[PDB]
Amino acid sequence: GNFKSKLKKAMLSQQITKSTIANKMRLKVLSAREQSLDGIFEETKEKLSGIANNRDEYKPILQSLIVEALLKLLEPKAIVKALERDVDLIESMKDDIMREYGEKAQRAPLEEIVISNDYLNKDLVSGGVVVSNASDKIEINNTLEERLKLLSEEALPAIRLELYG
Amino acid sequence: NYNTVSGVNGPLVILEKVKFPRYNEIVNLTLPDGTVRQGQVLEIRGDRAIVQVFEGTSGIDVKKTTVEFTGESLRIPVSEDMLGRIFDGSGRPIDNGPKVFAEDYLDINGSPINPYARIYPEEMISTGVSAIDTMNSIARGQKIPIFSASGLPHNEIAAQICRQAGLVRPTKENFSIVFAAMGVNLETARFFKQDFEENGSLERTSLFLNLANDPTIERIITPRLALTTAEYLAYQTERHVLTILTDMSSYADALREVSAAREEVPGRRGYPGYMYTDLSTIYERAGRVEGRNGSITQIPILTMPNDDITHPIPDLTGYITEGQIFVDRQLHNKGIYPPINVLPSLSRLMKSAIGEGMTRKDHGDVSNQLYAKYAIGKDAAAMKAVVGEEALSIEDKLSLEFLEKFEKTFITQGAYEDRTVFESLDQAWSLLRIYPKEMLNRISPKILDEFYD
Amino acid sequence: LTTAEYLAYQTERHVLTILTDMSSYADALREVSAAREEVPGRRGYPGYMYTDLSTIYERAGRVEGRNGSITQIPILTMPNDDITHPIPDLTGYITEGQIFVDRQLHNKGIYPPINVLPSLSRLMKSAIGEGMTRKDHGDVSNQLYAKYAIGKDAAAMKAVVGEEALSIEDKLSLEFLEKFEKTFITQGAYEDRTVFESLDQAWSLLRIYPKEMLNRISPKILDEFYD
Amino acid sequence: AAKEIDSYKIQKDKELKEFEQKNAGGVGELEKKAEAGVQGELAEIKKIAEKKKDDVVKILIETVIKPS
Amino acid sequence: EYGAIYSVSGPVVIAENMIGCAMYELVKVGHDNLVGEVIRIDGDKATIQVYEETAGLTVGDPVLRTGKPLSVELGPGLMETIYDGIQRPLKAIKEESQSIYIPRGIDTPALDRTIKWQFTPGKFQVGDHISGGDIYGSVFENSLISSHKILLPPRSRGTITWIAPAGEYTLDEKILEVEFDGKKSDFTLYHTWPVRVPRPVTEKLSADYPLLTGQRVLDALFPCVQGGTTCIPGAFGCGKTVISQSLSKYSNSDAIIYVGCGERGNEMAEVLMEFPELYTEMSGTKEPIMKRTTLVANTSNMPVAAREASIYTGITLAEYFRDQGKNVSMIADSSSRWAEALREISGRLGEMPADQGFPAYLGAKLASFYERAGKAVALGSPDRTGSVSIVAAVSPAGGDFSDPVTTATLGITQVFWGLDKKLAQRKHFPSINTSVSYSKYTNVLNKFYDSNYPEFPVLRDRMKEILSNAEELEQVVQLVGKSALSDSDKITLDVATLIKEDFLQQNGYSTYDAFCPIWKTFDMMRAFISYHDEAQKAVANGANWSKLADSTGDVKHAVSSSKFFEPSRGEKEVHGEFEKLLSTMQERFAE
Amino acid sequence: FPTRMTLGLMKTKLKGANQGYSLLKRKSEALTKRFRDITKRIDD
């Protein structure tokens, strides 16, 4: 009886070790799949970094993004924060931005656009824009990294549905 | 993202310079110390908005804080990879695993089943317990609670039930369950973890663990995530979903705390007035869907305060859920196996799993007869304890010994011991033999002649 | 309180504080709390009243390095003859021991009706003994209390089956109770008895009982007292 | 009677140790195969990683002009 | 931003220009800089609640905000120092101000910055990767325990650059310079941690390590493992102080953290006077017991904020000592006072009461305080193991168990040991009800004690069932009679009376009966079980009860001496007596 | 029905029933002893 109890305990330890090994295997599979997803996100981030290396292509995209951000603002005076490299480009596009803002909404004209003297870090931000009001109370993120990270939420399910069926 | 905030009072938050806020919308709160706390929107009036902080308003600057509003309602990252993996009350992995890939993002609030689309509880299941079979039957897909007391073996009984569930059920595709805890003890958490580990169902089940050390909001939101998970499992995954929830009392007291903190109009016993509907939200979510395979069976576990069955918690629980399994502290101090009170404990529909074509037609009548003999035995026990042992008739002492034997044998089996339905019916047939022939008036002649050896 | 404090920490002298009608001061404090238009608590009383009493009864005690000591003995009338009142419950766990009053003995046409059963003091252990009061103090106190209690039980028993069923210790406790009630308990309005006179009267009243009638007394004390 | 009892006890202990040894061997073999299965799953996940690399190129290209 | 009070209502004061300040943040009100706490915040005007007297505070007086929440200083100089609910020394207040009273608005440091200590880097060099909780050095504080480990403060991770060790420095001096991702940062031997936030640790674990109470009944019936939680009654005059002191002295823990809520002045003064009188018994005799322990005392006159949050500070200090990888214990006397203070705080917060005048956060706060204890592994490279043993006392107003405090105490604590005044009035040792005693930690404690094969659990459950049978026999004795029973019942009654005398009763006044070793209690239970088994065997052998009771008297007299004769180094001496009991059986097989 | 006066009357009746229970108990004991002595005397 005692030997049967001890044998049952040892067999229970064996089944527990088997369940732990199975849990480690499932955790390894999950870690591998997550490494694959993070790898795909890494390749997508590389493609995004490569797409942000073209100024000619990003110019009109920056204009459209600034227009879309201004449409989500509708403030009389708009404060804009951008990277140091996009400073001159945005400064030259100021008139085009005002014209595009006036064309987008004629019920809410744009009085002034204030360019912040604080530029985003070159290492931290590879591109994008930052929109804000005159009082800087509300802010919309036009940044590429933020847009991609936020999109990834609803994109992951769709990408998985496409790839894995 | 709005960095503008106006006032701060207690455990809440109020912001301005915003518009078109959504009820119970997901909102990210970035504090001055860099701490990122998730929160939900409470109400919105004009250009002003009011929301409740989950992580608390303690240690937060007014003008140094930023807030990002998603605008979408409460959203959870449900998936098919949740099986085998453990999650916390905040949705974050408690298994120390990598990022969980969401198959679908759905509201954790849950959608009420349409009456016409709602299917009645059917078939049956084997819980491994005689009282969970004979006295009160448990249908598959139905909803019944468990009322226990503090200090009693509630965790042990729940562990035994969860362990013997899928084991005994196969004698009637393995059964899949879900473990959920809200504001529970660390010791009870370790006990439940060791229970799920011993049962080995942890691989086929999911776990939502909200510690008592964690906030009340996360604990209350744990039930929603578990509800959405079980719903996705019983609909999208098309599998059998068992719902195991514990420490409902903590969530109730926390709910009363949240209701009082907002200075809202309280209901009975200082609780909320919407408490009935609040419980009925996840209570009426259980059931069967016509045309859809699988079902969600709700097996909640609650603890009545100060072992009081007259407590508002148990009353509202019974007013929400249909039927319950009561655990009395009177038989808990007897040293016998787990103390289920046959009188107070009952099932909503015990006639669905009864009758011919399912198991046997001798089930229900034997249940009624056994309940009658047990109740008569209890009354006779009271009378015997009152007047005396020599002041009672023969039927009184007979029913007394029968009830005592029913408590010592039928009611007492074991935690790791799962009694088959056949063994339960046989033990019941042997239990009825203890009583006289004219003792049971709830039994038919054919069953009486068939059961009696 | 400030007056007593000034004569203690500064003047260094023994002081004694006495407060009358603390219930009236409780209603007064209730009006003062209502002056701020604050929402009252249970039975129309402030929730900070516990701290209010904690800012009062804490003014009594002995100071280290100071010869002068200040003692306080407050008094409060229980509303509707009920000890369930918030005031009594507040002073109960705060102060050490409480002196109650029996309305029956007060209606019995006797001297001050302090029930020996309810009467207790936690610091009573340090207020007696050799060098303090007497070595016969505590023992005879407990013996007298036991005599009154057992005398009361015997009084209830004798009111049931009669005086014919009276036992030895029962009758002894009855006589002791009647005596203590008509002698020991009764003092007077202007009457002040010394501790020595109190102990002497206690021993004299306990002399009605035999030597083996007291199980609460020690052999050495009984040998050094009875004469 | 005592010798047969001690022999049966030694036999039971030997069978128990044999059971533990069998459990050890089985656990070892299972742990050996698990890594292989995880390797193959990693290979399938790698091919899927290439297909979803192309798919990530397309997805990023689609998400680039999204900012309208 | 410096605040200026635009409103004063009672103890509450609202100050504008407070926008810089945050919620639940301490502040200095008026020119006297009185201690206060910020309740709400509306725009630039925050509503703060002063815990001290609002008298003397006027308009125009600048209000300075601390900019942070309530915290405490963990490190060297903390030990051997008495403190209040606000964490301030009373003795230093009496030494400096030279007054018997404490003025309103006065402030003093918890740890002495004027005390020079000799510190030395133990396991930390320059260039090594370290984090929060990792020991950067060791400094000797008390005269008993080994040098208190100075560890890298929380939320600090980087490489060490300039170490000021070894050398002599105060607590206000930075002993290290750490280089993090935030570049240059300064670190000292003393740290500051929030009172509402438990001390950070590496990993949480379950406690299999039994804590020695030193009492026989305490270690046998309701044993409390190190890290475990136990509760008892707060009744005065029941001799609870003796049990508490004996538990603190005979504890196997390294340090002891005592945190009071509120009580009578005489009791607090008695405890304060009897505190330093205790001496150690480890290395013969080190320093006083107050040296390796911390004391926080708050009278009834103390603030409610210094009451309900006192347990948080005490637990913070206990966990701070547990962050050094040392087993500690937290003692709480009269928690019902902290509960009532929490009720007054609830009334002051405007929160609607739940039941019987209890707050809404009652259960949450109770569970939060109960979950702070336990045995775990602290954070940092050191990876030292530690524990915190929670011990609380409940002293309800009405004494009813229906009270919220009682229900919460019984619910949170897995171990509840009742203290009956009648049991103390029975002319016996420390009062505990055998009927109401229960514990849920028995299983793990038994499984853990089986490793050393020191098993109480068998004899514990056996003596429990024996106590139940003796209880039924006692109920039958008051029903029919004691002379109408059988031999087994009489033997059970005699064994029950014997166990309540030479076993359960242990005098703390004596030398060998003060602290009962594990081997001593185990040998006692073993000898008792041997006597009961021998009596039961002799009862079935056909031996008379009278002749046996007459012949075995010597065995009982010898077994009664097993509670004495000091040191158990020769515990085998008792085993021989057990053999003599078997000889007593042989004496029952003859006559 | 739920009044403080009713609670007082119920409590008073409860205490009176308790004292009456004690008195009836002691009386039952005395009656038991008396009936026992009278029983031995009846046998004699």
Curated annotation (Swiss-Prot), chain B:
It comes from the Eukaryota. CDD domains: ATP-synt_V_A-type_beta_C (cd18112), ATP-synt_V_A-type_beta_N (cd18118), V_A-ATPase_B (cd01135). One of its GO terms (cellular component) is membrane raft. ATP binds at residue 348. Its main location: membrane. PROSITE patterns: ATPASE_ALPHA_BETA (PS00152). GO terms for biological process: ATP metabolic process; endosomal lumen acidification; Golgi lumen acidification; intracellular calcium ion homeostasis; pexophagy; proteasome storage granule assembly; proton transmembrane transport; transmembrane transport. It is a peripheral membrane protein. It is found in: Vacuole membrane. Signal peptide: none annotated. Pfam families: ATP-synt_ab, ATP-synt_ab_N, ATP-synt_VA_C. Transmembrane segments: none annotated. Keywords: ATP-binding, Hydrogen ion transport, Ion transport, Isopeptide bond, Membrane, Nucleotide-binding, Phosphoprotein, Transport, Ubl conjugation, Vacuole. GO terms for molecular function: ATP binding; proton-transporting ATPase activity, rotational mechanism. The modification Phosphoserine is found at residue 111. PANTHER family: V-TYPE PROTON ATPASE SUBUNIT B (PTHR43389:SF4). V-ATPase is a heteromultimeric enzyme composed of a peripheral catalytic V1 complex (components A to H) attached to an integral membrane V0 proton pore complex (components: a, c, c', c'', d, e, f and VOA1). Interacts with RAV1 and RAV2 components of the RAVE complex, which are essential for the stability and assembly of V-ATPase. Belongs to the ATPase alpha/beta chains family. Present with 131000 molecules/cell in log phase SD medium. This is V-type proton ATPase subunit B. The gene is VMA2.
Curated annotation (Swiss-Prot), chain D:
It comes from the Eukaryota. Keywords: Acetylation, Hydrogen ion transport, Ion transport, Membrane, Transport, Vacuole. It is a peripheral membrane protein. GO terms for molecular function: ATP hydrolysis activity; proton-transporting ATPase activity, rotational mechanism. GO terms for biological process: endosomal lumen acidification; Golgi lumen acidification; proton transmembrane transport; vacuolar acidification. It is found in: Vacuole membrane. GO terms for cellular component: fungal-type vacuole membrane; Golgi membrane; proton-transporting V-type ATPase complex; vacuolar proton-transporting V-type ATPase complex; vacuolar proton-transporting V-type ATPase, V1 domain. V-ATPase is a heteromultimeric enzyme composed of a peripheral catalytic V1 complex (components A to H) attached to an integral membrane V0 proton pore complex (components: a, c, c', c'', d, e, f and VOA1). Subunit of the V1 complex of vacuolar(H+)-ATPase (V-ATPase), a multisubunit enzyme composed of a peripheral complex (V1) that hydrolyzes ATP and a membrane integral complex (V0) that translocates protons. V-ATPase is responsible for acidifying and maintaining the pH of intracellular compartments. Present with 2280 molecules/cell in log phase SD medium. Belongs to the V-ATPase G subunit family. This is V-type proton ATPase subunit G. The chain holds residues 39 to 106 of 114 of the full protein.
Curated annotation (Swiss-Prot), chain E:
It catalyses: ATP + H2O + 4 H(+)(in) = ADP + phosphate + 5 H(+)(out). The modification Phosphothreonine is found at residue 108. Its main location: membrane. Keywords: Acetylation, ATP-binding, Autocatalytic cleavage, DNA-binding, Endonuclease, Hydrogen ion transport, Hydrolase, Intron homing, Ion transport, Membrane, Nuclease, Nucleotide-binding, Phosphoprotein, Protein splicing, Translocase, Transport, Vacuole. It is found in: Vacuole membrane. InterPro entries: ATP-synt_VA_C, ATP-synth_a_Xtn, ATP_synth_asu-like_sf, ATPase_a/bsu_AS, ATPase_F1/V1/A1_a/bsu_N, ATPase_F1/V1/A1_a/bsu_N_sf, ATPase_F1/V1/A1_a/bsu_nucl-bd, ATPase_F1/V1_b/a_C. SUPFAM superfamilies: C-terminal domain of alpha and beta subunits of F1 ATP synthase (SSF47917), Hedgehog/intein (Hint) domain (SSF51294), Homing endonucleases (SSF55608), N-terminal domain of alpha and beta subunits of F1 ATP synthase (SSF50615), P-loop containing nucleoside triphosphate hydrolases (SSF52540). One of its GO terms (cellular component) is vacuolar proton-transporting V-type ATPase, V1 domain. It holds the Pfam family Hom_end_hint. The keyword Repeat does not apply. PANTHER family: H(+)-TRANSPORTING TWO-SECTOR ATPASE, V-TYPE PROTON ATPASE CATALYTIC SUBUNIT A. Catalytic subunit of the V1 complex of vacuolar(H+)-ATPase (V-ATPase), a multisubunit enzyme composed of a peripheral complex (V1) that hydrolyzes ATP and a membrane integral complex (V0) that translocates protons. V-ATPase is responsible for acidifying and maintaining the pH of intracellular compartments.
Swiss-Prot record, chain F:
Disulfide bonds: none annotated. It is found in: Vacuole membrane. It comes from the Eukaryota. Present with 8500 molecules/cell in log phase SD medium. Belongs to the V-ATPase D subunit family. Subunit of the V1 complex of vacuolar(H+)-ATPase (V-ATPase), a multisubunit enzyme composed of a peripheral complex (V1) that hydrolyzes ATP and a membrane integral complex (V0) that translocates protons. V-ATPase is responsible for acidifying and maintaining the pH of intracellular compartments. V-ATPase is a heteromultimeric enzyme composed of a peripheral catalytic V1 complex (components A to H) attached to an integral membrane V0 proton pore complex (components: a, c, c', c'', d, e, f and VOA1). Interacts with RAV1 and RAV2 components of the RAVE complex, which are essential for the stability and assembly of V-ATPase. This is V-type proton ATPase subunit D. It comes from Saccharomyces cerevisiae (strain ATCC 204508 / S288c) (Baker's yeast). The gene is VMA8. The chain holds residues 9 to 52 of 256 of the full protein.
